[model samples]
Target chain A: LSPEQLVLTLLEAEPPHVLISRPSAPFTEASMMMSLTKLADKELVHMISWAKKIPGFVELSLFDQVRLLESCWMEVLMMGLMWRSIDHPGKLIFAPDLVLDRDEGKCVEGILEIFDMLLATTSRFRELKLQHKEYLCVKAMILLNSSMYDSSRKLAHLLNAVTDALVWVIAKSGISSQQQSMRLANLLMLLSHVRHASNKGMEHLLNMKCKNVVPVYDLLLEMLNA
Target chain B: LSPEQLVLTLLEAEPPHVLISRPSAPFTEASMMMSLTKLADKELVHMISWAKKIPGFVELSLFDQVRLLESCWMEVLMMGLMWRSIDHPGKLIFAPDLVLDRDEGKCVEGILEIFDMLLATTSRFRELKLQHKEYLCVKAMILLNSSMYDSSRKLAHLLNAVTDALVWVIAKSGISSQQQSMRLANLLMLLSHVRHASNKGMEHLLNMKCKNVVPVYDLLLEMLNA
Candidate 1:
């Protein structure tokens, strides 16, 4: 579907409910989150800003708002994963100039903002884990991106180790949480741990994955040398 | 203090403990949030759109990032409150035009994106409460501005009643928060509720207080209307 059609359909879906209940008719979280995201994306940022006064809309339940927030978080995670391959530098990838339109960076940034929000919310343990998995995938993508500047092998090793650490963390507990994933701070801490544990393995992975991933791998090597 | 002075003072403040650990780190929660806000205020929205690398600044703790998100949220809420008042049709005060500033709206929109992040993380509770309080203040401010419209007495009365209701909510036994304010949604719902509660009071408040508070009042009204 077209972006417009997609927007319309998503909006048409019963908005998720908010968790908090203020004085008046509490907005359902589902509706509130969709309504705001769509408005922001459609360039109605001003209109959403203006929406504070409307009667039925302004007052929504606290719980409902929280719920809506969770829904938006889920959507953001989906988008980030979808674009992971397109934006990463170290992997075999299409030419940055060609794979995405000129403003590929912008699309990535917007999606990242949406994704970050999902990770930041304090909803549940499961939600946090989801955010962390996404973060690793994103970190890996960044390592693989063709346009990144700081190409110290040291940095690549640092990030690669982070990905492995995530796998280990998941394996250790046999349990994952959205909350853990969502906390970028905690995620980094986790990476720091994993980094300390498997530095050599990270180096090995980088060397192994570097070749034949695509022309982008060659581009990354060139950039590193430059 | 001047913005430059503010910037300088911030610079001199020991560079934060975490930055000290990373030594020469380029990314931190405090730095990123400030940078993003400044970019937004310049109407560099096109550039702002490329700030997807925000999550890349993962060196900072999630708690610090969460706090920064709160600062961003409150600032946007206040500015949005101001924008609504200044953009009303009946009158303009401060010879000041907020809506025309565009960047303010962009900043607010950016904050909303941050709010999305906060909700996804462990800080959702704080955000809900903050928005709740901001909404309460805004609801009262809107009533005070209603005097601008004709026969605004009813509006004044409505606002007064809604304010009372807000106080009542604060007093409820089940209410756990210490803050007396409402969320944007909550405040708007109350404003809508007041729209009917005391129409004559609203008109009177508008007539008498409108001149002084009209900018804020009207802005609140306009936002809800949108």
Candidate 2:
């Protein structure tokens, strides 16, 4: 693909639509844990394959690509997961078949904060009526941002283009410039939270794994940097 | 000027050649405080004007440009000072005629740590034999890096191009690729330290300003965000 083609493909490439099952979720024990990570693991496979198809991604030396993935798989997954659940408030649509309400979310113990943050983010996404193009561009920001610096200038310009498209998306929502700036700041604010969740969420995942609540795959280990 | 012309001009623009003086040194008082900021004040005038000449800098909105300068002016000055003293180990050539050795530097009470870090960084710069073009590019990074993001793509490419030219500079030293990476890492590491010095240095500046040990200008207040 040409650079532009690859960029288009990167945005248009359909994300994983994989599904998972839960036995009517009243008891928030190991099942919810297993279900989420199992779905995440499947999503990981699709994302890694998708990334390889990006123009410069595959050309990256092994360690470089590996670390980039390690740093941001959660964020990429978090973004996709949130984008999917955008229309449903107080409920997380982790997969098309797997929807969990806040009430149903508590069985997982000490995980309320993550759910709240996710639900909060998806609400902001709806607030801005975040377009598909913006999601792809923001996803690119997340991926490129993690890998390193010096690449900063390229990230700077690439993200600037993304920001322009994103602003255009915001503009169509029929708000004044005042609200547009707020919307942009709110959207960008969600990014900082993703990193915290990734870090804090990793520790939670490990704690659960230690108790054998959820089986951690080799892919999960790599993503978690364990 | 054309973009290429401005870029070349940015690299070629000579830094301030101001001079400062101090009484024979043996005291841990504010006279040393007065001397450093006095020299720094002159250097900053040169830099702010130098910044205006760089292609897009003057074109930014007032708040944007002001914040960018506020954020990284210290780093720019610090880099220039270190570069000037590059060949003179264990001495800081704050100006053409004003040199301060570790002993003389001690008069600025509680500032030994800052000097030590500066001397350590200069030693690393010498180790890498940092070239002129690279300094110019890295200065560009520090400036652009402070202003904002979304511009991240520009920064990524700008800094990447910088990395290439800087690597070329390192390559001319005849080191293997392994050592080249080390040199780059070392150089970039210095950038992180500059930010710390700027922050901590600001606090020290404010402390002295409050004590009436050194006078503050409107410009310094703006840079300090006071």
Candidate 3:
């Protein structure tokens, strides 16, 4: 898919509506594990499709591509979460059936604070009314440029292109120079938060492993280890 | 430096109290560049010192050491920044002379939002009254475990040691199980924010390079490229 199409696909990709027990309701560890496993399945597939959609992505080695996806899926997932409920305060609108309350998220290790940061991040995105074009460009910038191995030259070109696109979008918005600067600054700042979320996600996974609570599936494990 | 000493050194490693013109005051590009250069120099040196203080860090090849440092320095810096002013808001106490107001931070690309997130992060830390031992473990987790290269076995050992330390610190904090969970979650969440800030710092450097603003010094340039 083209970058624009990829962005749209990612933004529009929603998990199936399958309600599980609420956080306040009685829930078994097995049931919660099942729910999270299903959610992780959809997200990993979504990320695979998203990575494949990037131009020149297939040209890179499978190893490199997987490396990139593993490094950045959390950032993309956090970005998607923020976009879904930018205006919502305490809820993470993961999907119609997957909205999580702040307290409910505490069931998982290291998740309560993640929820708070996600809310703050989404609120910032909402305040900015971040445009679709800007979102696409910045997401591409974050994803493509977040590689850990070779391909800096290609990544740099992609980053420059999206950056130019972002500046153009800001310029065309007709805001004052100060407003433009603030908007760009906010976007960059949001990206930073996304990066933080990604690292936190890793720590969360580690914590889960240590606790031996969540039954992490192989697919999720692969992505986490990728 | 042992982990405790490392944390202490990082916390105590203050830059000299030499204030340049304020961001709001009239300042030349060269002057801003010089100020940032100095700040960056101290930070890079600080990061190097912190890393060397880590057990077995000096045993890593120069290439691996640089690679690890490049990837994790921003997170360390952000963690330090949050720890320094965690109890206060609207102030980034880089040093006696280098404190930044919220508004004045806007003069640099992507800094305003960074300041806001830092304040929020610091407030969260303040709320927890996070202990120095906990801080050191989490900071090490952020810095050492955040590698982009293939070094998981060694990194995992380091991560396990710190994770054990973190668990013990929390267990001994005398908080209830629920509060302990919340505290551990918050600490992990703070690491996530630190990661986000690190990525944002990279984007800021990119923005500066693109705009031909803030001339990056040789040390910082190498770090950024690494």
Candidate 4:
């Protein structure tokens, strides 16, 4: 009864989001932050468009669904960014057309460092030798956000099953059981950083909103305030 | 039972790498290589004895330990060195008495470049004020990762011990996630340089060995050959 496969299925079933068009060629400092924030908004906007693709995601009551997404859209976006750019070290693929490097990121006050941490976090993910399916599972877990669905039996079972699948995946590698656990825990440890990004990204967004630096509309605005 | 506790405990148990002995005075090429070789050989010995105390380490088959240590000791040693001097920024306390400023380190052959890189790495570690326990935990993971961790109970313990730093920096300080992430990445890049150090570091050792500039034996010999 492993929900391992279940997690991946929903993730793969997720509708893909596209990014095209530019903010205009030369970015002013205002546009620089705007450029960065707008891409984030695009991804954040798409975050809502594809929600029901996840199985129980729509099954949850509207308030519960909002709770889940509002709390973690930042986490979800960061997770997606890491996966897309996992292949390219020292570079971030914010969108298909919006490739960024640390040097280029320097124009935005906080972006270069954000890019640095993003790139750093990617290195940790880089070694995962990530398989497409495994990545799907990672995508699923980011939204599940863990244990929040406490009383939901099906949700609880799904969480248990997915986590079980992780042990199975890591333990299958040839190493002592202890090392397997060690690796698993370190993997778990990375989430706090993801959460850290969520908190910080939210702050950046608030700042951006204050400066009138970027447009935040509909889902992006509501979830961000939540 | 938590693996994280074990990781942190061993990290705390491990002795610091300090400079009790100085490179025989003078910046001559031969002596520079000689003392550099000496300090590394000294640190490599400490690396082994402390490693034994790590929970899963002794449980590994001899060859397995050999496999991991050979592969990752350079990374481990570098991680340890950075932790000791993380607060110092540009100067490396290679030994308590052996602190070498980058400018002073320039007299040796290629040490200047290595020194520059090491100093830059320290600057990154500087901000984390990376707690001693976290530093210890960070070191443990490096070795564990080289080999590769647990499943459940022990896993909970490990995450708790490690994440203390995560929460402290992010939760407490109006910590900028962007700057912090960059710091981690820079530390990670430092490890790459440390691994890179293995190449040039090893190349120099081989040269010194051939020149009879320093004596290489025991654990150093085994790791060198491996």
Better of 3 and 4 by DockQ: 3
CA deviation > 4 Å runs, candidate 2: A1-226, B1-7, B24-28, B147-168, B171-177
Error of 2 at B176 (Å): 4.2
Compose the digit string of candidate 1's lDDT tens values, residues B69-178: 32222223323333333324322111122122222223322333322222222122222343333333343333233221122334334333434443444444255332
**Model 1: TM-score for chain B:** 0.22
- Give stretches of model 4 more than 4 Å off: A1-4, A146-154, A171-179, B1-226
At residue B95, give the lDDT of candidate 3: 55
DockQ-best of 1 and 4: 4
Model 1 score (lDDT): 0.29
Query: Which one wins by TM-score: 2 or 4?
Result: 4
Candidate 2 docking: what grade? incorrect
Off by over 4 Å in 3: A1-25, A28-30, B1-14, B17-226
Q: What is the TM-score of each candidate against the true structure?
A: 0.20, 0.49, 0.50, 0.50
Report how far off residue A32 is in candidate 2 (Å).
29
Task: Give each model's clash number.
Answer: 99, 22, 3, 15
- The whole-model lDDT of each prediction reads 0.29, 0.66, 0.63, 0.60
| Candidate DockQ scores, in order | 0.01, 0.03, 0.09, 0.02
**Residue-by-residue lDDT tens digits, candidate 1, A1-226:** 3323322322342122222212144333333333322322332222232222212223444443233222222222222323333234222111222222223223322322332322222111233344434443333322221111122343333333433344344444544332222232233322211221122222222332343222223322322222
